[PDB]
């Protein structure tokens, strides 16, 4: 009798949202439906373009029901407020959405409440102004959850999906596969933070006050994560956006999506995570996440930069190109904060920088660099990461590089922190080495025969080549 | 240094309405003056304009209904950071 989607987000051991408010920017809603009645306030903020009654509030009512609905919702408690930025045909404008986001901020300034979650179950093409407003609203401390988009395409070409400092959500079905339907389906790629149930999702139907309907979409998926987020913020109201994002990733089911459904180049960029509620089991733990940069583009001096959130530390830095035409990567300081910068080679199509960004309070981290000697550097403190770059066209708390390369070690003073280094090598397209359960991968690199790159996937270090050795640095309290 | 942007997905563009975004520290009083200045310079050129909304709280700037003819003029006003042509969003 439990809808498949609510079972799917239930963790393997388990035991809301009322201190939290969730804003919905969508179509109009039927606020008297029994799933949500008395839990949703319609603001009657309205900003919509002209067309060109049951149908008008169908989309929004369903999503309001997915988030907080008493029978079929994720966060059955939670309070909601709705803004109308989509007309009866489900069309809105960027300008209308900005006015809506601005309205939320104004409301908050005039009558402050607790943590806010804003669900934006909508998408248009990439918008500089829309992404900036989302970012700006995020730095003010508001959590934003958005739909990846339904075009079976790279979510980075869409807004607010592509917007920095926002949780972007793709859709999976009852078989945990990406939803695909002809030329339509879930978006994917490095701007998607995680997936959630978004096919065949039962919820309030605006046909009648007790009716239910199944709908599908990245909007439905995003709604599960808004509900999950409302619960997490009720239990731990002081979470910053980065702590909330690291928790959503950590408590997700991992490696359950068959990534064959995605285009080849997006498989590596797309997180294989299906959202879940945190368990009853939770004392402090080390959380890390993998952040892919934008592709550097083909310029000879091109750099890709992967950054962490203000309250995270960059513990390691790696890079990857499909050609293997690569000058490696380095950790360099910038505004008093470390970023991961990767360098394109002459004639390369471009490269990605791949940061490992972690929540580590009481950490003092620095970088130790040595120019080309093989080349070696150590933490004279625990080693959390090795990076290496070169300027040539071709070839124990210690990092070792090629004799012609510079080598960079990330070293942290982190009392209460233990780290170990695990190595693995073989004859081979890909070599793999995982930290043990209860350990967190902080760094992933290849021992210095021609490597495309290395990157962390959850707690597994992957090295890609055309005598190769994967090296994982694993830490814990 | 002020730049213009419009939606890459051509069917989703909505020409004739523009979001004018001003530099970060611009004050609401300046946004208003800048909008009026645009309307005055436009009127002298024979163009009607309408200020639909003045932004403050997230981004400073304003929303304006006008012919795109005025964009060169608008990009040169004091405080302008960039201008974006409005475009469509859709329920997902």
């Amino acid at each position: 009798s439990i809808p498949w989607n609510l079972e799917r987000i239930t963790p393997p051991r388990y035991r809301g949202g009322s201190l939290v408010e969730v804003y919905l920017l969508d179509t109009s809603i039927q606020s008297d439906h029994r799933e949500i009645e008395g839990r949703v306030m319609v603001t009657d903020f309205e900003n919509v373009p002209e067309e060109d009654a049951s149908k008008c509030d169908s989309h929004g009512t369903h999503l309001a029901g997915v988030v907080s609905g008493r029978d079929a919702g994720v966060a059955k408690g939670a309070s909601m407020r709705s803004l109308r930025v989509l007309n009866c045909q489900g069309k809105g404008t960027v300008s209308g959405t900005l006015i809506g986001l601005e309205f939320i901020r104004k409301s908050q300034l005039v009558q402050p409440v607790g943590p806010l979650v804003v669900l934006l179950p909508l998408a248009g093409g990439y918008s500089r102004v829309l992404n900036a407003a989302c970012q700006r609203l995020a730095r003010a401390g508001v959590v934003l959850v958005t739909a990846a988009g339904n075009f079976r395409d790279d979510a980075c070409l869409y807004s607010p999906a592509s917007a920095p400092e926002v949780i972007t959500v793709g859709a999976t079905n009852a078989q945990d596969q990406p939803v695909t339907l002809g030329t339509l389906g879930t978006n994917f790629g490095r701007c998607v933070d995680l997936f959630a149930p978004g096919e065949d999702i039962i919820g309030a139907s605006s046909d009648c006050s007790t009716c239910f309907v199944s709908q599908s979409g990245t909007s439905q998926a995003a709604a599960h994560v808004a509900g999950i987020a409302a619960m997490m913020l009720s239990a731990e109201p002081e979470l910053t956006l980065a702590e909330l994002r690291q928790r959503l990733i950590h408590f997700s089911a991992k490696d359950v999506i068959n990534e064959a459904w995605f285009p080849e180049d997006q498989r590596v960029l797309t997180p294989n995570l299906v959202a879940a509620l945190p368990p009853s089991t939770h004392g402090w733990q080390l959380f890390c996440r993998t952040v892919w940069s934008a592709h550097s583009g083909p310029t000879r001096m091109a750099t890709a930069i992967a950054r962490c959130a203000p309250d995270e530390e960059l513990l390691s830095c790696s890079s990857f190109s499909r050609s293997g035409k690569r000058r490696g990567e380095r950790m360099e300081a910038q505004g008093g904060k470390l970023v991961c910068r990767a360098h394109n080679a002459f004639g390369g199509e471009g490269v990605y920088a791949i940061a490992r960004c972690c929540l580590l309070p009481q950490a003092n981290c620095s970088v130790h660099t040595a120019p080309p000697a093989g080349t070696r550097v150590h933490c004279h403190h625990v080693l959390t990461g090795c990076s290496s770059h070169w300027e040539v066209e071709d070839l124990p708390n210690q990092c070792v590089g090629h004799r012609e390369a510079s080598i960079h070690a990330s070293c942290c003073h982190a009392p209460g922190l233990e780290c170990k280094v695990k190595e693995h090598g073989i004859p081979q397209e890909q070599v793999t080495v995982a930290c043990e359960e209860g350990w967190t991968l902080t760094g992933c690199s290849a021992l210095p025969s021609h490597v495309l790159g290395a990157y962390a996937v959850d707690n597994t270090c992957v090295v890609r080549s055309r005598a190769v050795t994967a090296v994982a640095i694993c830490c814990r309290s | 240094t002020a730049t213009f942007h419009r939606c890459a997905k051509d069917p989703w563009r909505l020409p004739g309405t523009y979001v004018v975004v001003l530099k970060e520290e611009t004050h609401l009083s300046q946004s208003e003056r800048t909008a009026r200045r645009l309307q005055a310079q436009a009127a002298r050129r024979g163009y009607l304009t309408k200020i639909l909304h003045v932004f403050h709280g997230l981004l400073p700037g304003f929303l304006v209904k006008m012919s795109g003819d005025l964009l060169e003029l608008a990009l040169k006003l004091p405080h302008v950071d960039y201008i974006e042509e409005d475009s469509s969003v859709f329920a997902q």
Binding site: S58, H59, G90, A123, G149, N150, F151, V179, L181, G182, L184, G185, Q215, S216, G217 | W12, F90, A91, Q92
Partner: peptide
């Protein structure tokens, strides 16, 4: 669907 609205337009 045009464009990915209401359940994949389906």
């Amino acid at each position: 669907x045009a464009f990915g609205x209401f359940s994949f337009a389906g």
